[PDB]
Amino acid sequence: GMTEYKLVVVGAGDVGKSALTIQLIQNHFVDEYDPTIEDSYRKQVVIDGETCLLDILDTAGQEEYSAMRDQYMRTGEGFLCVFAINNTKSFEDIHHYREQIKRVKDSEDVPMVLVGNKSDLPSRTVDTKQAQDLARSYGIPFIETSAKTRQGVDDAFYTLVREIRKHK
Ligand SMILES: C[C@H](Oc1ccnc(-c2noc([C@@]3(C)CCCc4sc(N)c(C#N)c43)n2)n1)[C@@H]1CCC[N@H+]1C
Ligand SMILES: Nc1nc2c(ncn2[C@@H]2O[C@H](COP(=O)(O)OP(=O)(O)O)[C@@H](O)[C@H]2O)c(=O)[nH]1
Ligand SMILES: [Mg+2]
């Protein structure tokens, strides 16, 4: 049967989680997507010659640590932790997202990719070296993306699938 991979996109508001997701789903850059909409979106894709079904949860809204929200996030098999390369605060938030993923998955070994989005913009405030070194600290891949140009989009999502495959 066709394997389904449940991927969850997390990170600060405004980093481009929705734009990245929609580039994967629609193959279109959407510069405006209601910042409060949290939803999941499926798409069949070929990854290393194997058709699989991606189910991508694009997170949004208020930080909440209820049992219900933990259970919803626990359905994720792998996580994209997204910051924007022109927003230092979004990068400084990453460790919090990673810690919460480790907690809900009750595992030090959750499939994960660090994503530095908005790589098309000149206003960089987070050095590539610093982001690469954070991914190294965590032992995870780092992918530079742009939802605007499609740079890195498949790399980010497909790497996460490959990481889930390895973990399984
Ligand atoms: C960085 C923070 O801000 C926000 C703002 C919005 N969201 C978060 C946030 N942290 O983890 C999560 C996820 C969605 C990630 C996947 C696993 C779980 S499990 C569960 N229950 C979750 C939730 N809510 C999550 N989201 N954090 C700073 C720092 C602390 C104060 N705060 C202002
Ligand atoms: N230049 C540029 N703008 C982006 C990119 N991704 C998202 N944006 C913009 O960043 C803002 C927030 O994007 P959105 O997808 O809503 O972020 P979310 O809150 O993480 O879902 C919007 O103004 C988008 O147009 C990108 O890669 N490049
Ligand atoms: Mg959004």
Numbering used by the authors: 0 to 167
Extract from the study:
KRAS mutations are among the most frequent gain-of-function alterations found in patients with cancer and their therapeutic targeting has long been a key objective in precision oncology. The KRAS GTPase cycles between an active (GTP-bound) and an inactive (GDP-bound) state. Here we report the discovery and characterization of a non-covalent inhibitor that binds preferentially and with high affinity to the inactive state of KRAS while sparing NRAS and HRAS. The pan-KRAS inhibitor works by preferentially targeting the inactive state of KRAS to prevent its reactivation by nucleotide exchange.
Extensive optimization led to BI-2865, a derivative with a prolinol substituent and a pyrimidine linker, which enabled a direct ionic interaction with E62, as well as a water-mediated hydrogen bond network with the side chain of R68 and the main chain carbonyl of Q61. We established high-resolution cocrystal structures (1.0–1.1 Å) of the pan-KRASi (BI-2865) in complex with several KRAS variants. These showed a conserved binding pocket across variants defined by the α2 and α3 helices, the distal portion of the β1 sheet and the distal portion of the Switch II motif in KRAS. A part of the KRASi pocket overlapped with that occupied by covalent G12C inhibitors, such as sotorasib and adagrasib, with the notable difference that the pan-KRASi engaged the pocket without relying on a covalent tether and did not extend in the P-loop channel near the G12 residue. By comparison, the affinity was 60–140 times lower for KRAS variants loaded with the GTP analogue GCP. Selectivity for the inactive state is probably conferred by the conformation of the Switch II motif (including residues Q61 and E62), which partly occupies the drug pocket in the active state conformation of KRAS. Drug-bound, GDP-loaded KRAS variants had diminished activation by nucleotide exchange, either when the latter was stimulated by the nucleotide exchange factor SOS1 or by EDTA, as well as under intrinsic conditions.
